[PDB]
Design a protein around this nucleic acid. Structure first.
Ligand SMILES: [Zn+2]
Lengths: 104, 235, 263, 342, 104
DNA sequence: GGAGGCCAAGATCTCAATTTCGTACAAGAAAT
């Protein structure tokens, strides 16, 4: 509904953007609202300076620290900056390619 | 003049990186970026302002800014690409609208693009295409982040012309140990020979820009260095 | 005087002095090497190239533009009166022993045929094409310092400006008439010591194992296989000790792999 | 003297493709990837830089205009100095290599050379690669086939005399014969590729030289064709291009820029929007772009960006925004001091 | 200015993250017809963050009344339980002693 | 009748090979 409505408005206004471009724009905007919502979710853990919260993300699409080229690379911005070290030093339940590559 | 912490900066490599023999140091990138931010081709002022955002080793004469180290992932690794500049003599470039070619019998003397001073230059340059570029440095994180994100600086050679080594997604993460100059005796940057750090002997200036000033004997690391992205993010 | 072009001149092109001619004194730096006239003793050769450009060459630089059909043979039968030129030779290599001043000319079979027998007296010519230059470097005991002009080519200005003296086997500069900037010297650096030790250690591995190693390294250097897959292949075939001898530079890896696949 | 950073997005009106020698192999035409085939391709900043340099050269020639004779005042040497940047006549200001800030006289007198340098003189305009934002924003476009016009439409055979309907029959028989022969020759060639896979090394070099003899035999069979030389019923290989409406992020920057050089760059952008074409395959209208650039600058004395305006190139028009951009353009237009000559 | 002392001298637990938000919010609210954009995560007490600036500005032309839009009882009735027993203290120390509003 | 200006030859060869984003909830109104 949003895609076709926005495409309608950009087609009557005259902007020459493809429907796929509008789909990508709405997808990015939804991703931004996803990041905001998950920032609220993480904010539900801590509410006082003495709080000590164990955040368990069971989603396989949350970006691993090591996978910096993951599609959802923005999604570590749910974590506050002040805990980003703990993001970088974290426990992974089902990690991948946990071996040692000899072409270092 | 500012407090300086050991930071490691990792950026997603968008373009192949042409290495000009010596590995591109982060201080040179920051010197280009400050040469833009405060418009200045005079080395002294840019160096002075770089010292305000980057730590400078007085006993060595070098900036606390390690050379380029490619961060290779298990999916993508260091690759051998060719940064290729080709002259494109378009039909509009070879037209009388732009210039008056020498004329004989009403015929316009064609440009000898095969050879000569008016040839189609095909400049191929070795470039290394790894998924990530990582540097280690001791300095102000906010300033270096601002420069690397909102200045026209790349890594390698001719980024201002060939757009080689374009990077994005600059991530700065704090380090526990200063790995910008030295690491277990292995030089991580162009250092003078008298420093006692072992590496590859070469001829270069220590402080940027690395193409001016007397080129003295230095010890610099392997031009192409690779580390696993996991090991780089371990810190 | 103290420049690589003088070394190659004295070693290799000093054979064409009697057809070279008396220099004409000049006041501008040689356009071919680009060096200032302070070492040319104030003299030079005035010349016009095929693009009608007024060019000054020094005693070493001019030798590449000299036509000596009676010594170097006829390069093209359609133009008999001009002979083979050192600056117009493509696919022709040369190893110049700077200290000994001796030179060996790695020419293909056609070039060897075109050369008159008088040429072989002054210059020791071995029949080898551009593919067998690395074979000659590998097998022969090189004497250092030396200048290894891999390809004389036609871009004589870029050949002279690319000339670098190879002080040892660790870094042999393969000058191939392409301008040797600091950005492309990795393609023109032949690390023969490491290549020789890697070939020595390749003997311990089977033919299939060495083919797998070469293919894996070539694909990885071209980013055709993921590093994880390449590491899996290396570990499964037990090729790690080979990998420890590889330079981290992928272009150096490709150069030494070309060297191995030639020997 | 302000470093204008233009950061912004290029939306692709018609697919954006470029042929690069390393990127294109015998496997097919691919965009430069900066890695393997799985990596994200980028439109090189070199192609955009060349396009904008050509646009700037067109601006400079139009501003200069023609002589009373109706001929451009620029000769071959000046034309190549302004277009490719290389000295052909050996007459150029060879500044000392240790002087970073050299050429101020030439930079002032020639703003095109100042923006886009010549050999021996660093330029002041740095163009970046159009980096795509998405994951599936490229694809195999074009391709298709060169259908024989007379085997598709028969109406086109009522316009040929019999002496040419027999030349059509002869060219199609030659095409079929040649394609069969080339087919079997390529089959033997691939079997030879298999024997290279073996690489038993007994006679591998000879196997390569006979492969070369086989390519020569392909060229011989393809010279025996005396009516045509190339098979007209050719399947066209697709080229890799960025999808229509692909958001590619672009960083351009003029460092230490006078108002005149910046105005010349903006006029080059304005003229480029007349034909906003990047890259090749212009037969398929490839390269038509619309791009919005946020022109920021660095605050004097601090590491902060201040926005000076936006350059919105669209098929509907160029929307220069910001009073300082207009001031730069007017400064470049009004200055009667440029001598785009020796 | 006075705000900092009247805050800490009132016994209230001023934080380092609080002062920068107080000053930025007040300075932004000085600019007429402009719009302020702030992210203040858990720990900055954004309620106080955009309340102490209101009292700094109140010193100038105190007639100016301020509207605090809210989402829901998730965040409303926290401000009721914060501004009454936290802000009124510094307001007293700052002499403001201004009256609250409910418009729900 | 010496200056352009176009055109043919020079012997050799390196190497690399692909199969589909994101799937919701609230709270809260002086109304369009
Ligand atoms: Zn010379």
């Amino acid at each position: 509904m949003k895609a076709e409505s926005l495409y309608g408005y950009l087609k009557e206004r005259g902007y020459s953007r493809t429907f796929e471009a509008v789909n990508r724009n709405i997808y990015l905007e939804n991703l931004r609202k996803v990041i905001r919502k998950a920032k609220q979710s993480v904010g539900r853990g801590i509410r006082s300076e003495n709080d000590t919260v164990r955040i368990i993300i069971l989603d396989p699409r949350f970006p691993e620290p090591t996978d910096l080229s993951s599609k959802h690379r923005s999604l570590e911005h749910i974590i506050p900056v002040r805990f980003r070290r703990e993001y970088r030093s974290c426990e992974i339940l089902s990690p991948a390619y946990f071996e040692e590559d000899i072409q270092c | 003049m500012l407090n300086f912490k050991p930071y490691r900066v990792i950026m997603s490599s968008l373009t192949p990186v042409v290495i000009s023999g010596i590995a591109p140091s982060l201080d040179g990138i920051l010197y280009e970026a400050l040469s833009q931010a405060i418009p200045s081709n005079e080395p002294g002022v840019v160096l002075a302002r770089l010292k305000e955002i980057l730590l400078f080793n007085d006993e060595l004469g070098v900036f606390h800014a390690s050379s380029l180290r490619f961060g290779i992932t298990p999916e993508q690794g260091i690759g051998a690409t060719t940064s290729m500049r080709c002259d494109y003599l378009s039909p509009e470039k070879l037209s009388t609208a732009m210039f008056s070619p020498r004329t004989r019998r009403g015929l316009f003397t064609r440009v000898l693009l095969t050879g000569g001073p008016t040839k189609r230059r095909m400049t191929t340059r070795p470039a290394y295409s790894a998924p990530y570029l990582t540097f280690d440095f001791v300095g102000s994180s906010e300033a270096v982040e601002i420069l690397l994100n909102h200045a026209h600086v790349g890594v390698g050679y001719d980024y201002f012309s060939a757009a080689n080594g374009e990077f994005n997604n600059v991530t700065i993460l704090p380090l526990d140990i200063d790995t910008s100059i030295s690491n277990e005796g292995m030089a991580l940057r162009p250092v003078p020979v008298n420093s006692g750090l072992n590496g590859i002997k070469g001829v270069s200036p220590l402080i940027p820009p690395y193409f001016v000033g007397e080129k003295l004997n230095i010890v610099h690391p392997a031009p192409v260095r690779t580390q696993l992205i996991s090991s780089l993010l371990r810190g | 005087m103290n420049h690589p072009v003088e070394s190659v001149y004295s070693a290799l092109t000093s054979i064409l002095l009697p057809y070279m001619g008396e220099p004409v004194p000049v006041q501008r730096n040689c356009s071919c090497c680009g060096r200032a006239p302070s070492e040319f003793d104030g003299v030079g050769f005035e010349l016009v190239n095929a693009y009608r450009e007024r060019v000054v060459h020094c005693r070493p630089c001019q030798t590449f533009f000299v036509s000596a059909p009676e010594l170097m043979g006829v390069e093209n039968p359609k133009k008999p009166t001009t002979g083979q030129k050192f600056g117009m030779w493509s696919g022709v290599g040369a190893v110049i022993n700077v200290e000994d001043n001796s030179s060996v000319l790695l020419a293909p079979q056609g070039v060897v045929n075109k050369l008159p027998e008088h040429f072989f007296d002054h210059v020791e010519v071995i029949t080898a094409t551009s593919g067998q230059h690395l074979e000659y470097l590998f097998n022969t005991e090189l004497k250092f310092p030396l200048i290894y002009i891999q390809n004389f080519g036609v871009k004589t200005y870029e050949l002279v400006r690319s000339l670098r003296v190879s002080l040892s086997a660790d870094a042999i500069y393969t000058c191939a008439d392409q301008l040797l900037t600091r950005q492309n010297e990795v393609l023109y650096m032949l690390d023969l010591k490491k290549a020789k030790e890697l070939h020595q250690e390749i003997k311990n591995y089977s033919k299939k194992e060495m083919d797998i190693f070469i293919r894996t390294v070539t694909l990885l250097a071209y980013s055709r296989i993921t590093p994880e897959a390449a590491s899996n292949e290396f570990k499964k075939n037990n090729l790690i000790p080979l990998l420890l001898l590889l330079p981290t530079d992928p272009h150096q890896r490709l150069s030494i792999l070309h060297l191995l696949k030639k020997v | 003297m302000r470093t204008l950073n233009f950061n912004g997005k290029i939306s692709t009106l018609e697919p954006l493709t470029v042929t690069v020698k390393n990127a294109v192999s015998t496997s097919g035409h691919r965009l430069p990837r900066n890695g393997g085939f799985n990596a994200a391709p980028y439109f090189p900043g070199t192609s955009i830089r060349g396009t904008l340099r050509h646009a700037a050269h067109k601006v400079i020639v139009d501003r200069v205009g023609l002589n009373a004779d109706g001929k451009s005042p620029f000769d071959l040497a000046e034309h190549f100095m302004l277009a490719q940047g290389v000295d052909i006549n050996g007459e150029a200001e060879t500044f000392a290599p240790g002087e970073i800030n050299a050429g101020a006289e030439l930079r002032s007198k020639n703003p095109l050379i100042s923006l886009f340098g010549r050999w021996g003189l660093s330029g002041k305009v740095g163009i970046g690669n159009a980096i795509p934002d998405g994951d599936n924003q490229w694809g195999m476009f074009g391709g298709g086939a060169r259908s024989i016009m007379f085997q598709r439409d028969e109406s086109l055979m009522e316009f040929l005399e019999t002496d040419q309907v027999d030349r059509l029959e002869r060219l199609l028989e030659e095409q079929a014969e040649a394609s069969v022969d080339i087919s079997q020759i390529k089959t033997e060639q691939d079997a030879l590729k298999k024997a290279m896979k073996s690489a038993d090394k007994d006679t591998k070099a000879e196997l390569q030289i006979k492969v070369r003899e086989l390519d020569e035999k392909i060229q011989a069979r393809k010279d025996q064709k005396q009516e045509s030389r190339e098979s007209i019923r050719r399947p066209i290989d697709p080229y890799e291009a960025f999808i229509t409406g692909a958001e590619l992020s672009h960083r351009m920057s003029i460092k230490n820029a006078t108002d005149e050089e910046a105005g010349l760059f903006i006029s080059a952008l304005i003229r480029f929007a007349a034909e906003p074409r990047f890259g090749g395959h212009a037969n398929h209208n490839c390269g038509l772009v619309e791009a919005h650039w946020t022109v920021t600058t660095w605050k004097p004395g601090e590491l902060v960006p201040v926005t000076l305006g936006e350059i919105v190139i669209t098929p509907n028009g160029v929307e220069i925004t910001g009073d300082e951009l207009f001031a730069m353009v007017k400064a470049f237009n009004e200055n009667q001091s440029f001598d785009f000559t020796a | 200015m006075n705000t900092s002392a009247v805050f800490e001298s009132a016994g209230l637990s001023l934080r380092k993250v609080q002062q920068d938000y107080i000053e930025a919010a007040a300075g932004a609210l000085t600019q007429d017809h402009k719009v302020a954009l702030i992210s203040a995560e858990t720990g900055v007490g954004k309620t106080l963050g955009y309340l102490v600036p209101a009292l700094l500005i109140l010193l100038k032309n105190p007639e100016a009344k301020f509207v605090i839009a809210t989402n829901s009882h998730a965040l409303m009735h926290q401000i009721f339980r914060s501004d009454r027993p936290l802000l009124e203290q510094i307001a007293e120390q700052c002499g403001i002693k201004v009256t609250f509003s409910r418009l729900m």
